[PDB]
Amino acid sequence: LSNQISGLNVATRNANDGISLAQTAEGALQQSTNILQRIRDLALQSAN
Amino acid sequence: GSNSDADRAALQKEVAAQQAELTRISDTTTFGGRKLLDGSFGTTSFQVG
Numbered sequence: 001l002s003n004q005i006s007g008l009n010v011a012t013r014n015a016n017d018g019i020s021l022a023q024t025a026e027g028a029l030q031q032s033t034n035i036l037q038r039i040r041d042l043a044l045q046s047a048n
Numbered sequence: 049g050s051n052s053d054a055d056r057a058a059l060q061k062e063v064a065a066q067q068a069e070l071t072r073i074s075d076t077t078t079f080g081g082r083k084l085l086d087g088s089f090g091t092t093s094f095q096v097g
């Protein structure tokens with residue numbers, strides 16, 4: 001039981017690091033979506 | 049996370065220190081110069097009758 005408890009605790013910690021990494025990745029992806037929609041605006045403006 | 053902590057080398061040093069501590073716990077049990085759990089224990093039998 002102590003083995004399982006400690007394993008689940010360190011797993012909670014590692015999962016927290018994983019959620020943080022995924023949050024950074026999703027933030028970068030949202031930034032890239034903004035940049036891409038900006039390129040779309042410049043492209044449709046470039047119709048001229 | 050299988051890719052995040054580039055100091056798995058430091059992790060290896062620390063777990064090596066841990067296993068050396070294990071081997072040291074194996075030793076230093078010199079209860080009579082007849083080390084109990086490490087080395088060569090004769091597997092004795094205490095007489096009670």
